[PDB]
Design an enzyme around this catalytic site. Sequence first.
Site, short mmCIF file in Angstrom:
data_model
loop_
_atom_site.label_atom_id
_atom_site.label_comp_id
_atom_site.label_asym_id
_atom_site.label_seq_id
_atom_site.Cartn_x
_atom_site.Cartn_y
_atom_site.Cartn_z
N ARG A 18 5.33 1.81 3.58
CA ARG A 18 5.20 2.15 2.16
C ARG A 18 6.43 1.83 1.35
O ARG A 18 7.43 1.33 1.87
CB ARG A 18 4.97 3.66 2.01
CG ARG A 18 3.69 4.19 2.60
CD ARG A 18 2.55 4.11 1.62
NE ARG A 18 1.34 4.65 2.21
CZ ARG A 18 0.31 5.13 1.54
NH1 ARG A 18 0.33 5.15 0.21
NH2 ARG A 18 -0.75 5.57 2.19
N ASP A 49 -2.55 7.98 -8.00
CA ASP A 49 -3.07 8.76 -6.89
C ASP A 49 -3.58 10.18 -7.16
O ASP A 49 -4.52 10.62 -6.51
CB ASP A 49 -2.01 8.79 -5.79
CG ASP A 49 -2.52 9.34 -4.47
OD1 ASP A 49 -2.10 10.44 -4.09
OD2 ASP A 49 -3.34 8.67 -3.81
N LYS A 57 1.56 15.27 -1.05
CA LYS A 57 0.22 15.78 -0.83
C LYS A 57 0.20 17.29 -0.70
O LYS A 57 -0.85 17.91 -0.76
CB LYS A 57 -0.39 15.10 0.39
CG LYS A 57 -0.60 13.61 0.20
CD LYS A 57 -1.50 13.33 -1.01
CE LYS A 57 -1.79 11.85 -1.20
NZ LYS A 57 -2.62 11.29 -0.12
N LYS A 94 -6.99 2.20 -4.54
CA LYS A 94 -6.61 2.92 -5.75
C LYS A 94 -5.34 2.38 -6.40
O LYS A 94 -5.33 2.11 -7.59
CB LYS A 94 -6.45 4.42 -5.47
CG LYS A 94 -7.71 5.10 -4.97
CD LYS A 94 -7.48 6.59 -4.74
CE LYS A 94 -6.46 6.83 -3.61
NZ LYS A 94 -6.92 6.33 -2.28
N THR A 95 -4.31 2.16 -5.59
CA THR A 95 -3.03 1.65 -6.10
C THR A 95 -3.06 0.15 -6.39
O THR A 95 -2.49 -0.33 -7.37
CB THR A 95 -1.88 1.98 -5.11
OG1 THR A 95 -1.80 3.39 -4.91
CG2 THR A 95 -0.54 1.49 -5.64
N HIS A 130 -8.39 13.09 -6.63
CA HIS A 130 -7.67 12.18 -5.77
C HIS A 130 -8.09 10.81 -6.30
O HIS A 130 -9.02 10.17 -5.78
CB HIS A 130 -8.08 12.34 -4.31
CG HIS A 130 -7.35 11.44 -3.36
ND1 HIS A 130 -7.89 11.02 -2.17
CD2 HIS A 130 -6.12 10.87 -3.44
CE1 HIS A 130 -7.03 10.22 -1.55
NE2 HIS A 130 -5.95 10.12 -2.30
N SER A 156 -7.73 6.75 1.73
CA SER A 156 -6.56 5.93 1.98
C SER A 156 -6.90 4.49 2.35
O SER A 156 -7.79 4.25 3.17
CB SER A 156 -5.67 6.57 3.05
OG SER A 156 -4.58 5.73 3.35
N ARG A 158 1.00 11.67 7.56
CA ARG A 158 0.86 13.12 7.50
C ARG A 158 0.40 13.68 8.83
O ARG A 158 -0.04 12.95 9.71
CB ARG A 158 -0.12 13.53 6.41
CG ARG A 158 0.45 13.58 5.00
CD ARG A 158 -0.67 13.79 4.01
NE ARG A 158 -1.71 12.79 4.24
CZ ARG A 158 -2.93 13.05 4.71
NH1 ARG A 158 -3.27 14.29 5.01
NH2 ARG A 158 -3.78 12.06 4.93
N1 LIG Z 1 -10.43 -6.41 -1.95
C1 LIG Z 1 -9.42 -5.56 -1.82
N2 LIG Z 1 -9.26 -4.56 -2.70
C2 LIG Z 1 -8.23 -3.71 -2.56
N3 LIG Z 1 -7.29 -3.70 -1.61
C3 LIG Z 1 -7.46 -4.74 -0.74
C4 LIG Z 1 -8.47 -5.68 -0.77
N4 LIG Z 1 -8.33 -6.57 0.28
C5 LIG Z 1 -7.27 -6.16 0.93
N5 LIG Z 1 -6.69 -5.05 0.37
C6 LIG Z 1 -5.49 -4.35 0.89
O1 LIG Z 1 -5.95 -3.03 1.12
C7 LIG Z 1 -4.92 -2.09 0.82
C8 LIG Z 1 -5.37 -1.18 -0.30
O2 LIG Z 1 -4.28 -0.29 -0.48
P1 LIG Z 1 -3.90 0.72 -1.63
O3 LIG Z 1 -4.40 0.25 -2.92
O4 LIG Z 1 -2.50 1.08 -1.44
O5 LIG Z 1 -4.88 1.91 -1.06
P2 LIG Z 1 -4.98 3.32 -1.74
O6 LIG Z 1 -4.07 3.38 -2.88
O7 LIG Z 1 -6.40 3.63 -2.01
O8 LIG Z 1 -4.49 3.99 -0.36
C9 LIG Z 1 -3.68 -2.90 0.39
O9 LIG Z 1 -2.89 -3.12 1.59
C10 LIG Z 1 -4.35 -4.19 -0.11
O10 LIG Z 1 -3.47 -5.34 -0.12
MG LIG Z 2 -2.23 4.60 -3.11
#
Ligand SMILES: Nc1ncnc2c1ncn2[C@@H]1O[C@H](COP(=O)(O)OP(=O)(O)O)[C@@H](O)[C@H]1O
Ligand SMILES: [Mg+2]
Length: 535
Positions: free
Chosen positions: A328, A264, A208, A249-250, A227, A245, A60
């Site tokens: 992504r 999200d 967003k 979350k995902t 969020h 970010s 963004r």
């Molecule tokens: N312990 C952990 N918990 C969550 N994500 C982790 C962890 N260790 C590494 N990661 C990495 O961190 C990133 C978390 O991303 P994501 O869940 O997409 O973030 P959000 O959705 O909050 O932006 C992913 O690339 C994931 O593989």
């Molecule tokens: Mg996410």
Amino acid sequence: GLTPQELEAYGISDVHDIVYNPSYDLLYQEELDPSLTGYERGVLTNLGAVAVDTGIFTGRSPKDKYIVRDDTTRDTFWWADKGKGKNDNKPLSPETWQHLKGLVTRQLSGKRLFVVDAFCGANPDTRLSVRFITEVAWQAHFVKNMFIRPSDEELAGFKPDFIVMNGAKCTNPQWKEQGLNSENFVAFNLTERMQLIGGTWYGGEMKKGMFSMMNYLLPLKGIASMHCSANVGEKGDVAVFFGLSGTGKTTLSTDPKRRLIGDDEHGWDDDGVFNFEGGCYAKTIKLSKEAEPEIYNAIRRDALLENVTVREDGTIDFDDGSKTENTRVSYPIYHIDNIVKPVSKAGHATKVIFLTADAFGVLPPVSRLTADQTQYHFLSGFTAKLAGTERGITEPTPTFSACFGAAFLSLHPTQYAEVLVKRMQAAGAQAYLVNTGWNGTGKRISIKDTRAIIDAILNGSLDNAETFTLPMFNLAIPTELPGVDTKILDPRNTYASPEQWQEKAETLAKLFIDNFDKYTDTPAGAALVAAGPKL
Ligand SMILES: Nc1ncnc2c1ncn2[C@@H]1O[C@H](COP(=O)(O)OP(=O)(O)O)[C@@H](O)[C@H]1O
Ligand SMILES: [Mg+2]
């Protein structure tokens, strides 16, 4: 469908070819068209999903975000220039908006246009009927994936509440004279119910973009706009995972033991937590099929890969972040096997998890928050990153984004805190803080330990465990949890000595203290200071 006379009402002229409500099969052939040039081009990966490049803009552009200040938004918006906290809601004149609208509508005029009608919000009573207009097929695909795809009956009587015209190919030549950040622009007009985009191709601006509109409209009606990620257990117990970010979350809400509600954006009304979207937007950097099988499995035909490096043979090198670390993959929510359906909603949340990736290696893997520590940490919106890991050494960079998502806040952060607390208290929700980030090992805690921690929070194990208070931050941390390594539970254990941990806790605490000062302008905010870290 849609007529050229209606597109003309928007200001778009000479539209000969119109693709209304494009199918996934059409979008598929559109992206794979051999005669496409540049960023519109898509390649087919061995996983069956098409991969595209979002262009120069690979994330963004908050610096280019503007909202028209008029008699409808003047006294209600959280303006970046009213000196009430740092935000990207820069004011725009009605006059400059019209110039930008001229730029976008002219760019889309005489072009083949894709018109995607969709909903933002799972509930009929509070959702937005958004009509997306674009000239790039993968962009229409992005919004078909990310928003709620109407049914034939909903499409029949579809009356748009908001319009987002994507003029990513056009730029703004008059920016310097108009006092803008650059030739690019992501502007919003609440009076005309419209969003305009120029210069940036990044689909995340539309996603967003409507989120920010929901973030504006919902709290004004008493509904929390959050969020957060969200899932439900087979008993009906709902959990929401807030976070900035890259916090998880995902990754964490996509648990096979629970039904995915959303990943999200969610609202929280009188009936419960409802998803705003129709898909998930997963990070693919260094993606592991073994560590994230469900997300990896979702990557196939209809999922849209972005900025990842596709080799000659069509295989993907997910670890390659040379184009961007923000690689992504968007996909319809149904690409995840265990989800809530037909509607993406459920009951009131009883568990509220605040995820944070602490680059300082100070916060503990998990701690159950007090009612005041919950509000304090919500408004704080902390996370940190090891900026410079590529240029040399660690050097943790903090980020304090109110409500764990200030970049999309359209109202003051306290308006979100309030409605959230009102919802939590009525449901008897409990809040927890999870450091999905770093330890004294200089490494990030494993996804295995983190998921084992989330299970413990959800099944009541964390609540039944004997805890003790971690100093400085005064956080209750368990002595032990099922499936979690006990050593990491207390952050001081990962260092050579608790004094080494102390040094960092002191540095991070002053960061928090300095950041929270702006909220102490009210009696309530002054009281919460007691809840934060203390030197
Ligand atoms: N312990 C952990 N918990 C969550 N994500 C982790 C962890 N260790 C590494 N990661 C990495 O961190 C990133 C978390 O991303 P994501 O869940 O997409 O973030 P959000 O959705 O909050 O932006 C992913 O690339 C994931 O593989
Ligand atoms: Mg996410």
